[PDB]
C-alpha cells in the first residue's frame, strides 16, 4: 500500500509554514537554504550518505527566521532523529 503518512505530515508542516508566512514571503527563501546545507550530503559524496552538519545548527538558524512561533519548531522535532520519546 505504501507508507506516505509522514510525507503528508511534512507537507502539512510546509503548507502551514507557507500559510503563516504570508506576511513574510522571504522566509520561503532562507528556510530551505539553511536545510540545503544539511541535505547537501546525499549529492556531495560519490557514495555514502552523511549527517550534513550538526542538527542543532540547522535548527538554530530556522529559529531566528520563524521567531515568535515555537509551535513550528515543535513539529521540526519530528524531522530530527534524536531519541524518539
Amino acid at each position: 500500500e505504501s507508507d506516505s503518512v509522514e510525507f503528508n505530515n511534512a507537507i502539512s508542516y510546509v503548507n502551514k509554514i507557507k500559510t503563516r508566512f504570508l506576511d513574510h514571503p522571504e522566509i520561503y527563501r532562507s528556510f530551505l537554504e539553511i536545510l540545503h546545507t544539511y541535505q547537501k550530503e546525499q549529492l556531495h559524496t560519490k557514495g555514502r550518505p552523511f549527517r550534513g552538519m550538526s542538527e542543532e545548527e540547522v535548527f538554530t538558524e530556522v529559529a531566528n527566521l520563524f521567531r515568535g512561533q515555537e509551535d513550528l519548531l515543535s513539529e521540526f522535532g519530528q524531522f530530527l532523529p534524536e531519541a524518539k520519546r
Binding site: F7, A10, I11, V14, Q42, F79
Partner: peptide
C-alpha cells in the same frame, strides 16, 4: 520511517510543483 530533514526539501519542491499542476 524516513522522518529526516530531507523531507522538508522534498515537501517544499513537491508543494512548489503542486501549485503549477493545479492551474491547468
Amino acid at each position: 520511517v524516513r522522518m529526516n530533514i530531507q523531507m522538508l526539501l522534498e515537501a517544499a519542491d513537491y508543494l512548489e510543483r503542486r501549485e503549477r499542476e493545479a492551474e491547468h
